[PDB]
Amino acid sequence: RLIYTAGGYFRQSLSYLEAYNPSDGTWLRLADLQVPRSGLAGCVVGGLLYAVGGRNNSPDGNTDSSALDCYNPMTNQWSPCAPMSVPRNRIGVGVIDGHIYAVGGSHGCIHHNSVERYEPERDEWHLVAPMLTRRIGVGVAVLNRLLYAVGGFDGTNRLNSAECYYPERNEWRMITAMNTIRSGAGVCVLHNCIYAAGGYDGQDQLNSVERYDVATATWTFVAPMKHRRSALGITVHQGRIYVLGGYDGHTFLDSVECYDPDTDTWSEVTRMTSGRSGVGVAVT
Ligand SMILES: Nc1nc(=S)[nH]c2[nH]ncc12
């Protein structure tokens, strides 16, 4: 299984689809996205990779995206899917059962608190209960069939709050806030904790990382990353976290760091073929 990077940003929005193998270290280049996008999210349902939302920043325009697009790794082809009800740049995305949840994001000055659900087998989106908060640059993660929206930006304030979506009830409820304000952090599930790595707090990009334990309902810092980064890509592969690219306040990183929880340590594991931020990332 590989870690896929889709889209991203470096001087403009990118179409690159590339896969890194932490086992042999190789980067293999696959089919370009139909439309370049940064600020998108990636996920996998039934082994198919989806690209959700984002934005095409080019010298000729800046268009937020409603597009959902699907990649088959054995056939190397993108297929357009039904679009969301609104464009969602800097979207968050999570998967519960077999449905794709599109969370937050922006459309111009509009900062969404709305959430939509996609059924890959029916190719339909439907609006779901909105969050308590407007959130662009939000991290989304799923634990025990529960959907977490973590941090982000409401248009005026960067956020340390997190809220939890209950599918059976169709309602959101706040949880304990993170210790650190973070928009554009990488958010994932590793074991039985929600991790939030990096981001931007409104003054600096962050290298700190913290994790949420649902049993105790508390957030705890762990070892920081080596590079401060916002708008990083994050995923979990064989019980380890990977962060891909991002921005440190000066440069777009190609650095890829890997966190080992048993040792609570980060190590640089590779460089992307080119620096970028705002990628979608998933594993299949
Ligand atoms: N790196 C940054 N991330 C966010 S979300 N906002 C920012 N303003 N200026 C830098 C950044």
Mutate to test the pocket of ligand 1, among 136, 230, 276 (most ligand atoms within 8 A of CB): 230
The atom of ligand 1 lying closest to the CA of 136 is: 5
C-beta separation of 209 from 195 below 8 A: yes
Token pair listed for 185: 């952090």
Residues 6+ away with beta carbon under 8 Å from 62 = 55, 56
Going from the Cα of 200 to the center of ligand 1, the distance in angstroms, rounded, reads 6
Residue 120 three-state SS: coil
C-beta separation of 106 from 125 below 8 A: no
Going from the Cα of 182 to the center of ligand 1, the distance in angstroms, rounded, reads 10
Question: CB under 6 Å to ligand 1: residues?
Answer: 137, 153, 183-184, 200, 205, 230-231, 247
Taking the C-alpha atoms of residue 102 and residue 23, their distance in angstroms, rounded to an integer, is: 31
CATH of the domain at 141: 2.120.10.80
Going from the Cα of 126 to the center of ligand 1, the distance in angstroms, rounded, reads 31
The atom of ligand 1 lying closest to the CA of 199 is: 3
Range of the domain at 163: 1-284
The atom of ligand 1 lying closest to the CA of 137 is: 5
Which residues is the chain interrupted after (C–N above 2.5 Å)?
A: none
Number of domains, the chain: 1
Token pair listed for 196: 């939030």
Token pair listed for 203: 């003054």
Taking the C-alpha atoms of residue 54 and residue 276, their distance in angstroms, rounded to an integer, is: 14
Mutate to test the pocket of ligand 1, among 154, 180, 200, 251 (most ligand atoms within 8 A of CB): 200
Taking the C-alpha atoms of residue 158 and residue 114, their distance in angstroms, rounded to an integer, is: 18
Locate tokens 């890509």: which residue?
233
Going from the Cα of 5 to the center of ligand 1, the distance in angstroms, rounded, reads 21
C-beta separation of 201 from 194 below 8 A: no
DSSP letter for each residue of 69-88: EEEETTTTEEEEEPPPSS--
Going from the Cα of 155 to the center of ligand 1, the distance in angstroms, rounded, reads 12
Atom 6, ligand 1: residue with shortest CA distance: 200
The atom of ligand 1 lying closest to the CA of 230 is: 1
Going from the Cα of 19 to the center of ligand 1, the distance in angstroms, rounded, reads 26
In this structure, the number of other CB atoms found within 10 A of the CB of residue 30 comes to 18
* Gyration radius from the chain CA atoms: 17
Going from the Cα of 73 to the center of ligand 1, the distance in angstroms, rounded, reads 33
Taking the C-alpha atoms of residue 62 and residue 219, their distance in angstroms, rounded to an integer, is: 37
Beta-ladder partners of 283: 3
Beta-ladder partners of 236: 241
